[PDB]
Amino acid sequence: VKYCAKPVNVAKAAQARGDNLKVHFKNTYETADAIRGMKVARAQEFLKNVIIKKEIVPFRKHNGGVGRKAQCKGLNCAFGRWPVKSAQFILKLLKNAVDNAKAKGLNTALLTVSHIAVQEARSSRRRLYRAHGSINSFSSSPCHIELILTEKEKKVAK
Amino acid sequence: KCRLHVNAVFMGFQRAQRNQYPNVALLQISGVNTKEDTPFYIGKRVAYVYKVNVKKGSNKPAIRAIFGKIVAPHGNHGVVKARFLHNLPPKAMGQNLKVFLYPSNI
Amino acid sequence: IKPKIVKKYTGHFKRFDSNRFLRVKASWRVPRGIDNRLRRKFKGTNLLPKIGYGSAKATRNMLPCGLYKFPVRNTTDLEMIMMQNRKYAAEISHAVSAKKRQEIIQRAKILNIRVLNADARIKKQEVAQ
Amino acid sequence: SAPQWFVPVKAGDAKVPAYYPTDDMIQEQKKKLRTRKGAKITALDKPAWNLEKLRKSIVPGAILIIVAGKYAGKKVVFLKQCIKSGALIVTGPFKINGVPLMRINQRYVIATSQKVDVSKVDTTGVDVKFFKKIAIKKAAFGKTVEEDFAKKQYEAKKALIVEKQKQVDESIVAEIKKVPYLKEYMASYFTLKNGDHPHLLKF
RNA sequence: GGAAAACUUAAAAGAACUUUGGAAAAAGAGUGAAAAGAGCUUGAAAGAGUAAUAUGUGAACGGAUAAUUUAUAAGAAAAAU
RNA sequence: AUAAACAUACUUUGAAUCGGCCAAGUCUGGUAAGCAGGACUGGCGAUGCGGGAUGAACCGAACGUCGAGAUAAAGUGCCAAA
RNA sequence: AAAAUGAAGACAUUUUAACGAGUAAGGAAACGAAAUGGCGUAAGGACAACAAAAGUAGUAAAGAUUUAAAGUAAUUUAGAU
Known part of the structure; x- marks a missing residue:
């Protein structure tokens, strides 16, 4: 699986990726949407609070039946949850990407989450035994995750 | 500097109850309350001058114009028919149109 | 010298209901339905191809430059329109290589024949050259 | 001879057929x-x-x-018609309105009804030669x-002749002051006030 | 009673060593003409994700006419006696 | 009297169709029916356009793509051109 | 429809006049003044650089995605990846 975008300056960016991750796409797509653009130092602190249920992940698009919370004030969204499994999976990729920046030799404090995308993977089917001799499907929803962290420096365009 | 035009109101195109012909635009010249005061204006120039908020780096003019001529009366209440180079934008209904004094036959 | 080419309808005649369904393509098909809105020429939807839209015979199939089209595959194809260079224009076929395209373009300049693919399949001489 | 459709061109040492003439006998046109x-030029005295x-x-x-153009709203004095172009030759005497000697089509x-008359205007020059002499032309x-500076120098060199032909204005200027309130009338812009309906105005 | 399932490359040369990770893997490095990377010739539509741009009071979409923005896009000749 | 030469007379081969519906200075059964059934014509079906707010049949008028002008039914306080 | 011209031009000739709504249905091919005109898919037989190297193709085929042009339309053409 290839990356959606390529960095403008490869020498100042680092990448991490996961393929066929056993985590719900609908939940992870919202978690990655929350931390897009925030600094790596800040992002790791947001994801830990989602684990201990102190910061919300607004479910902007997949909000069917999702209950309202008190931490969803100001985000223009009335619904949010605390997906722990999806937050942990991102936390392992952010650490992997950061260790790539250290190998390259970039300054950690200047890295932001410039690009992060989630794609739908191939599902695995199972059996659910129903009334009157019917069998249905019990399908996982895995996903691919890409992450590109770039050093943030001031730009000028005259 | 001076006022060399008479304001006319772009009421709307030549139309019927359920149709519309944007080739001809109807105008209400100020002070013309009857069709017998129309023969003076038949043939005078008419301009729809509008303003466009252009960006600093664009060389397009900030004041553009569409010109046209008054061709015939329309009804007994001093309403005229004007045909322009390009049909007037329907967003300009109720705006003012400069009715000049040339081609002068005085 | 070049006449005024007048097109009676510059838009596209799109198939009915093609804007609502992705299975119905936009290539025109006359609706034969017994209750069809378009084939009964209802107000609002009465736009069907007719012979009346045909452009003038004099200025038909004429490119905007004022000439016609004459596809060429080699240099010898150009020799068929050297007496009519004021009437035709060479149009190199899409499969002709870049090596052969230079020979056609070089010869067509000799014979004073316009080529409409003069900047086709050109080399990478756009940056750093 | 050459076919009427055949206009030979030089070949840049490229490959040419056996029937095509070589470079040494091709002279480009x-x-x-x-x-x-x-347009033809006729006598200055004929229309x-x-x-x-x-x-x-x-x-x-x-x-x-004048109800159109650069000098819109100004008043002028009509001397005569340019026979070579059909445009009026007017002067809103420069000492009064600042309108110079120019040509304006009669439709503008x-x-x-106010008439200055004035004979002996001394229009010996001021013909189609003079207006073509003082016109500012482009840089081909x-x-x-030759960017920018071309027009600035043109006005400087044609300025002297412009003043020279303003000897015409010496007669109308004196006469205009004879009529009370006329000099104020001439120098002031023409305006359409409230209740000034053009179909009712008369001049 | 009774199916489905064809294709890497010319050649496996099928990455092989380091860092992060419990591991799978990822980032480098390398092979190859080209990753074509084994879910391997090309890679469409339906469905998603990212980026750019635009719009908004109980449907949406289409047509005619203009305005705005963007794009395409027409020339090197040359006057009178 | 009027009209009629892309007039007139056809010949051969064959398609589809024979559930029809409407109007009326018309009729029969019925208390009557947007009911049932007929005589003559015109329509809808197979037909859009302008008008009757909306309407298969009513009124004007039947359609190649367009520009300008007089018009038809019918309209002219605003929606809506007058 | 009628006149005129006619071995090859070309736009299926030139001129004049009338005409052009439509369900079911019909108008097979060919027919120089053509007894309707055409577009598209695949396969077979020929034609395709006329001076002895004769359609395009690793100086990039088919396919795919788009940008523009031609055609009333069916569709065709070319650029870029």
Whole structure:
């Protein structure tokens, strides 16, 4: 699986990726949407609070039946949850990407989450035994995750 | 500097109850309350001058114009028919149109 | 010298209901339905191809430059329109290589024949050259 | 000889067929695009075939109102008609209105009833030569670049002749001051006030 | 009673060593003409994700006419006696 | 009298169709029916356009793509051109 | 429809006049003044650089995605990846 975008300056960016991750796409797509653009130092602190249920992940698009919370004030969204499994999976990729920046030799404090995308993977089917001799499907929803962290420096365009 | 035009109101195109012909635009010249005061204006120039908020780096003019001529009366209440180079934008209904004094036959 | 080419309808005649369904393509098909809105020429939807839209015979199939089209595959194809260079224009076929395209373009300049693919399949001489 | 459709061109040492002539016997011809002859020049005293018929209200010495163009709203004095172009030759005497000697088509003016008359205007010059002499022309196409400065120098060199022909204004200026309130009337812009309906105004 | 399932490359040369990780893997490095990377010739539509741009009071979409923005896109000749 | 030469007379081969519906200075059964059934014509079906707010049949008028002008039914306080 | 011209031009000739709504249905091919005109898919037989190297193709085929042009339309053409 290839990356959606390529960095403008490869020498100042680092990448991490996961393929066929056993985590719900609908939940992870919202978690990655929350931390897009925030600094790596800040992002790791947001994801830990989602684990201990102190910061919300607004479910902007997949909000069917999702209950309202008190931490969803100001985000223009009335619904949010605390997906722990999806937050942990991102936390392992952010650490992997950061260790790539250290190998390259970039300054950690200047890295932001410039690009992060989630794609739908191939599902695995199972059996659910129903009334009157019917069998249905019990399908996982895995996903691919890409992450590109770039050093943030001031730009000028005259 | 001076006022060399008479304001006319772009009421709307030549139309019927359920149709519309944007080739001809109807105008209400100020002070013309009857069709017998129309023969003076038949043939005078008419301009729809509008303003466009252009960006600093664009060389397009900030004041553009569409010109046209008054061709015939329309009804007994001093309403005229004007045909322009390009049909007037329907967003300009109720705006003012400069009715000049040339081609002068005085 | 070049006449005024007048097109009676510059838009596209799109198939009915093609804007609502992705299975119905936009290539025109006359609706034969017994209750069809378009084939009964209802107000609002009465736009069907007719012979009346045909452009003038004099200025038909004429490119905007004022000439016609004459596809060429080699240099010898150009020799068929050297007496009519004021009437035709060479149009190199899409499969002709870049090596052969230079020979056609070089010869067509000799014979004073316009080529409409003069900047086709050109080399990478756009940056750093 | 050569076919009427055959216009030989030089081959840049490229591959040419056996029937095509070589470079040594090909002499290139300049592309010719101008096929229509320009206008003829006739005697300065005779009128052009393309002469408009002026309105009966427009007579020499009458005062006209310019209702279009750069000098819109100004008042001028009509001396005579340019026979070679059909445009009126007016002067809103420069000491009064600042309108110089110029040419204006009769469709952009209104003939007022006020008339300055004035004979002996001394129009010995001020013909189609004079107006073509003081016109500011562009910098052609192939004349190097000559950006910006070309027009600034043109006004300086043509300024002297412009003043020289303002000896015409010496007569109307004196007469205009004879009529009370006329000098104020001439120097002031023409305006359409409240209740000034053009179909009711009369001049 | 009774199916489905064809294709890497010319050649496996099928990455092989380091860092992060419990591991799978990822980032480098390398092979190859080209990753074509084994879910391997090309890679469409339906469905998503990212980026750019635009719009908004109980449907949406289409047509005619203009305005705005963007794009395409027409020339090197040359006057009178 | 009027009209009629892309007039007139056809010949051969064959398609589809024979559930029909409407109007009326018309009729029969019925208390009557947007009911049932007929005589003559015109329509809808197979037909859009302008008008009757909306309407298969009513009124004007039947359609190649367009520009300008007089018009038809019918309209002219605003929606809506007058 | 009628006149005129006619071995090859070309736009299926030139001129004049009338005409052009439509369900079911019909108008097979060919027919120089053509007894309707055409577009598209695949396969077979020929034609395709006329001076002895004769359609395009690793100086990039088919396919795919788009940008523009031609055609009333069916569709065709070319650029970029």
